[PDB]
Design an enzyme around this catalytic site. Structure first.
Site, PDB file in Angstrom:
ATOM      1  N   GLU B  59       0.838  -1.176   0.000  1.00  0.00           N
ATOM      2  CA  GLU B  59       0.000   0.000   0.000  1.00  0.00           C
ATOM      3  C   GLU B  59       0.890   1.248   0.000  1.00  0.00           C
ATOM      4  O   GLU B  59       0.451   2.338  -0.370  1.00  0.00           O
ATOM      5  CB  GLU B  59      -0.859  -0.011   1.253  1.00  0.00           C
ATOM      6  CG  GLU B  59      -1.994   0.963   1.225  1.00  0.00           C
ATOM      7  CD  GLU B  59      -2.141   1.694   2.535  1.00  0.00           C
ATOM      8  OE1 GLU B  59      -1.317   2.608   2.790  1.00  0.00           O
ATOM      9  OE2 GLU B  59      -3.070   1.344   3.304  1.00  0.00           O
ATOM     10  N   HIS B  60       2.140   1.085   0.432  1.00  0.00           N
ATOM     11  CA  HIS B  60       3.087   2.198   0.487  1.00  0.00           C
ATOM     12  C   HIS B  60       3.770   2.482  -0.831  1.00  0.00           C
ATOM     13  O   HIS B  60       4.091   3.638  -1.123  1.00  0.00           O
ATOM     14  CB  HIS B  60       4.170   1.959   1.545  1.00  0.00           C
ATOM     15  CG  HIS B  60       3.904   2.652   2.846  1.00  0.00           C
ATOM     16  ND1 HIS B  60       4.864   2.800   3.822  1.00  0.00           N
ATOM     17  CD2 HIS B  60       2.783   3.236   3.334  1.00  0.00           C
ATOM     18  CE1 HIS B  60       4.349   3.446   4.854  1.00  0.00           C
ATOM     19  NE2 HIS B  60       3.087   3.723   4.582  1.00  0.00           N
ATOM     20  N   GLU B 136       5.952   5.726  10.731  1.00  0.00           N
ATOM     21  CA  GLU B 136       4.512   5.791  10.901  1.00  0.00           C
ATOM     22  C   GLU B 136       4.103   4.905  12.062  1.00  0.00           C
ATOM     23  O   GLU B 136       2.924   4.778  12.372  1.00  0.00           O
ATOM     24  CB  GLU B 136       3.795   5.338   9.641  1.00  0.00           C
ATOM     25  CG  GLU B 136       4.143   6.171   8.459  1.00  0.00           C
ATOM     26  CD  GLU B 136       3.227   5.884   7.311  1.00  0.00           C
ATOM     27  OE1 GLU B 136       3.035   4.681   7.018  1.00  0.00           O
ATOM     28  OE2 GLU B 136       2.698   6.851   6.713  1.00  0.00           O
TER      29      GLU B 136
END
Lengths: 100, 443, 421, 220
Positions: B59-60, B136
């Site tokens: 997803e990154h 994150e």
């Protein structure tokens, strides 16, 4: 008619809470509604009610009353709370009937 | 015009499947703008002990380019047409989607098809997104609400796969390899498990047409048309307490085992959860709010906030509530709550529910406020329910629910059930599984 | 019935009524008003703010109780939204209940009683409502900017100042309603409704006469700086200058120069190359940061500049780079094509803002109150491309010359002063 | 000092040279009175150019000498009374730091008059920076200054402070007759100049109170 009106005046002098300088609504028993009402009183009206009682109390402790000339007179008796109360009560009556 | 009707005018949602597995759906409107996206049924739930963190590491990189058009090019071409490309990835449902003008409906799909299939995966980019994910985390770690909900999962489903963080482990994100990332994409991002959804001023045909052209990849063996069924996740009554009297407030989260997406009971449950609703400091409602717990919460300064939840999954799900409070009210609060839970199972009235319904009703309606959220409803619907559930249906299913119904379901799922407990903070005042268990009956 | 038409009547007293039936299962009625902390004088500050939270307080036709229980009973919602110069009361709910949610929406904005106690019993909330918002440094710097870029009205803070918490009165509130929430400054905008209902209701119930009540102190520009040392890890900063007014065709320029400098991301965890400013900064800074184009448009003024956020050590260069990137932009370094792109991003952004029922009711409202008109979506898009590469290079110049205002917060140890740019 | 003191020598860590800024800080607080001080870089310590301000200080009126007085030897004060009607107060501000200093006036007044009281504070400083200083006003401020100083050496505390400051910034001690000499060695020019060095340079302001009718620096 003008009977209840000449009756009430009597009873009023009869109960005699005036002898202590206490207004009609000073002698009210403080249930939950009254309590609530009293909190809604304008700064002063409250500080005033206060004195009157702390003074009446001081009397009852000394066993004396006020000289005739300082007593409250049936017609000069201010019902400073009656309105605030009927509102509290009116308000409550609602919440209660609405919870059905 | 009445509500009942505005309900049936909403355009039936169209669907068709490609002989390779992909399924395409979308609701047509008049808006000149719109949103389209691929709704993959992937997530950490499908991950294992060695690859925890793929769905995320992916997803990154799903936005740093493809092989056809590297970094800049991708972004450039997208920005330059005003479109919006965002995405996410839960435990069992990843998703990539774009918002843009109905005009570019096709060109868009092309791009979506380019991320999901031809993701770049440059070795210079990964070893950079590695340092970032790692950050994150240091951050996501200070979001108690989430540090809790993870722990809740981590012990409610403890031992299974569901009980893992989506962002994955610290060790994994430190060692995952181009290789491992590849496999995740390869093994998981497959058409029979993906859904092309969109909403806006688009024609159904026009849309599918694009699909046929970029979402090619036609399969040979039956293997590729098969949806790997997942191993069951064991619920386990228990608790996990993370203390640190150095924190300002404490978060607590209680729960029972949910029913699982399919079950028609989830409706009743959501009706219930509405009765108790949620509250939070700023709520102008105040002491007059209808939620008993909200009311009490206010009168006695019980908590900064609380909320009910009904997280559902393919086979299972979590059901409960989470509140934040001062170290010296965790108790009273917890107690009031568990009580309101009981109330549900024992004396919910027709009024309590009448309101609840109307609430749920407009809540579900606001789930379809715009193109992106409408789309999301479709992406998720197909992938979970296996079709589209119209508000006309959802609504009828709610009109059905009455007191008796709730009382039996809540009892059915709550009453005398060993709960999952997760607490975080200066949590000393709340202190006993047993005592809590004991609060699961009579009310 | 897909397409209907957007009506908009205007009663005698000046109460603009905007309708629009889009047949969505739910309506959203509201009362926009020319109100706000811009009509506040030194002596009655924040009385705007409290008025916002005083929303649930009893009225001459409904109790603090009945209002909240009455609305929740239908799965309704009541919310107040306000800028420095515009308040917005609006309820939402299912179509079959709008009838009832209205009574309160009306009662709230037209007949508040502001009982002495319900009020003094609610003031402590300000302390709170204020404390939450301020968790976002984002908002702290904006408060200061406005006060550092103005002498009055707009300089007034949106959240009641600390000293005045608890000193606001019932009279003070009243005179703020009698003197502002007048029919000519009100607009009854609604979605998912028939213009016939909304109108009928607006007239048969509404009272309080028209008239600008109390004119607002013309916005005098100041242009000063406000630096707030707080030891916090990141340095937020916004440097701006007098901008455009709502409606000036010049304002559309900045709105384009906004996008030209890069005003936000479009790709999650992106790099945004279509952002001169952003990209412009990365070519100077090494560590994580963030920069964007700031732009506000007020009835009689406006602001414009950039807003940064960075590590305190690089805070300086990150801001200086933010300027040099604005100069090299105010001087013919704008491709006639960058302009063509910003135009779509702008056409887009706008268009997507009409998706959320809330986003629509706001566009309809603002317009329906500042002019009682409604410019079709094709006309607005027309006033957008009607922009020249010059208007832009000029917007960028109108900046580097005029007096600038600054605002900060954080370890401003290595951060720069306005006079050093 | 010798046999007992330890901690080694050396200027340790030099101080960041004083850069002048010159901005304004207005603090709205609803309070009944408005305090304000408008100043400009002044002289530094021991720098001849100070003695001037130190005299221009007394020339504008830097405090009262008669309880509940009117202080006529106060240009500033008297200067303001001829503009304001209600109670207020104003005086001459003056500080001297090693590598810089400040100078101006400080007011205090009702919030409604706050404006005019400050404005008057300025016009009274201009009409002072422009040859409106009697060669005699200067002769008076010289005594007031010779005096004030001399009385500060009365309290053991007051003395130990004068001895110290000097004894630390130079390791010297200027006799009381020498100091009084560097005082009268002031010319009416040095004064009219001090007053001028003010109206030209960049000014800094500070407030607090209901600054509703109070003025901004840019409006003087």
């Amino acid at each position: 008619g003008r009977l209840m009106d000449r009756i009430r005046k009597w009873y009023y002098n009869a109960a005699g809470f005036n002898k202590y300088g206490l207004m009609r609504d000073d002698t009210l028993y403080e249930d939950d509604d009254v309590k609530e009402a009293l909190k809604r009183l304008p700064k002063d009206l409250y500080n005033e009610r206060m004195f009157r009682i702390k003074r009446a109390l001081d009397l009852s402790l000394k066993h004396r009353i006020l000289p005739k000339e300082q007593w409250v007179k049936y017609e000069e008796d201010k019902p400073y709370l009656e309105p605030y109360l009927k509102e509290v009560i009116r308000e409550r009556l609602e919440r209660e009937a609405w919870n059905k | 015009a009445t509500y009942a009707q505005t309900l049936q005018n909403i355009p039936e949602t169209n669907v068709t499947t490609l002989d390779n597995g992909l399924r395409v759906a979308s609701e047509e409107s008049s808006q000149p703008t719109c949103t389209v996206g691929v709704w993959i049924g992937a997530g950490s739930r499908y991950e294992n002990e060695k690859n925890n963190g793929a769905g995320y590491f992916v997803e990154h990189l799903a936005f740093k380019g493809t092989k056809k058009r590297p970094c800049a090019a991708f972004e450039k071409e997208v920005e330059s047409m005003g479109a919006h490309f965002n995405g996410y990835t839960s435990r069992e449902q990843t998703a990539f989607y774009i918002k843009a003008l109905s005009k570019d409906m096709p060109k868009v799909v092309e791009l979506l098809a380019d991320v999901v299939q031809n993701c770049a995966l440059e070795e210079s980019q990964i070893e950079k997104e590695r340092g970032v994910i790692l950050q994150e985390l240091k951050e996501m770690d200070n979001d108690m609400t989430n540090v809790t909900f993870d722990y809740l999962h981590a012990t409610a489903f403890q031992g299974t796969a569901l009980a893992r963080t989506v962002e994955g482990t610290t060790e994994n994100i430190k060692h995952l390899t181009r290789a491992d990332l590849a496999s995740y994409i390869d093994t998981h991002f497959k058409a029979p498990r993906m859904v092309l959804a969109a909403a806006g001023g688009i024609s159904h045909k026009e849309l599918v047409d694009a699909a046929r052209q970029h979402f090619s990849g036609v399969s040979f063996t039956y293997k590729e048309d098969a949806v790997p069924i997942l191993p069951r996740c064991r619920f386990t009554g228990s608790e996990i307490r993370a203390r640190d009297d150095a924190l300002p407030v404490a978060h607590v989260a209680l729960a029972v085992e949910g029913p699982g997406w399919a079950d028609p009971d989830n409706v009743v449950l959501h009706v219930a959860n509405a009765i108790i609703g949620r509250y939070d400091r700023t709520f102008g409602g105040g002491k007059h709010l209808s939620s008993r717990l909200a009311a009490l919460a206010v009168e006695h300064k019980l908590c900064h906030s609380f909320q009910t939840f009904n997280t559902s999954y393919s086979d299972t799900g979590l059901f409960g509530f989470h509140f934040v409070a001062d170290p010296l009210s965790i108790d009273d609060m917890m107690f009031c709550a568990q009580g309101e839970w009981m109330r549900l199972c024992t004396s919910t009235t027709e009024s309590e529910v009448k309101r609840a319904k109307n609430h749920l009703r407009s809540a579900m309606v606001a789930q379809l406020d715009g193109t992106t959220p409408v789309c999301e409803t479709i992406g998720s619907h197909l992938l979970n329910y296996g079709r589209r559930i119209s508000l006309e249906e959802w609504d009828s299913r709610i009109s059905a629910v009455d007191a008796r119904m709730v009382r039996d379901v809540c009892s059915k799922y709550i009453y005398d059930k060993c709960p999952a407990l997760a607490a975080v903070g200066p949590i000393e005042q709340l202190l006993d599984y047993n005592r809590i268990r004991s609060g699961m009956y009579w009310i | 019935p897909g397409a209907e038409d957007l009506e908009i009547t205007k009663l005698p007293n000046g109460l603009i009524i905007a309708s629009l039936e889009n047949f969505s299962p739910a309506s959203r009625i509201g009362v926009f008003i020319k109100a706000g902390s811009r009509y506040e004088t030194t002596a009655n500050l924040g009385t705007a703010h409290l008025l916002r939270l005083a929303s649930p307080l009893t009225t001459k036709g409904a109790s603090s109780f009945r209002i909240t229980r009455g609305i929740e009973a239908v799965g309704g919602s009541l919310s107040v939204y306000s800028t420095r110069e515009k308040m917005t009361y609006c309820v939402e709910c299912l179509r079959d209940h709008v009838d009832t949610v209205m009574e309160y929406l009306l009662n709230v904005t037209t007949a508040p009683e502001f009982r002495p106690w319900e009020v003094t019993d609610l003031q402590p909330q300000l302390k709170v409502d204020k404390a939450v918002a301020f968790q976002s440094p984002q908002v702290g710097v904006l408060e200061n900017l406005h006060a550092a870029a103005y002498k009055t009205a707009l300089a007034n803070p949106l959240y009641c100042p600390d000293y005045r918490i608890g000193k606001i009165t019932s009279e003070q509130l009243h005179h703020f309603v009698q003197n502002n929430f007048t029919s000519a400054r009100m607009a009854l905008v609604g979605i998912g409704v028939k213009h016939s209902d909304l109108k009928q209701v607006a007239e048969q119930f509404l009272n309080i006469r028209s008239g600008a009540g109390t004119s607002s102190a013309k916005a005098t520009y100041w242009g000063g700086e406000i630096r707030e040392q707080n030891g916090h890890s990141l340095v937020h900063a916004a440097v701006v200058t007098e901008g455009a007014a709502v409606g000036s065709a010049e304002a559309n320029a900045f709105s384009v120069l906004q996008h030209v400098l890069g005003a936000g991301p479009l790709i999650k965890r992106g790099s945004s190359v279509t952002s001169k400013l952003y990209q412009g900064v990365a070519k100077a800074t090494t560590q994580p940061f963030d920069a964007s184009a700031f732009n506000v448009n007020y009835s009689d003024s406006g602001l414009f500049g950039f807003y940064t956020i960075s590590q305190a050590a690089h805070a300086g260069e990150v801001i200086r780079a933010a300027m040099n990137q604005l100069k090299a932009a105010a001087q013919g370094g704008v491709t006639e094509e960058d302009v063509t792109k910003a135009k779509n991003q702008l056409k887009a952004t706008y268009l997507m803002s009409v998706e959320t029922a809330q986003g629509l009711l706001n566009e309809i409202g603002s317009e329906a109150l500042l002019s009682g008109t409604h410019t079709a979506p094709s006309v607005v898009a027309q006033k957008i491309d009607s922009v020249t590469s010059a208007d832009v290079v000029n917007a960028a110049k109108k900046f580097v010359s005029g007096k600038k205002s600054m605002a900060a917060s954080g370890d401003l140890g290595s951060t720069p002063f306005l006079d050093e740019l």
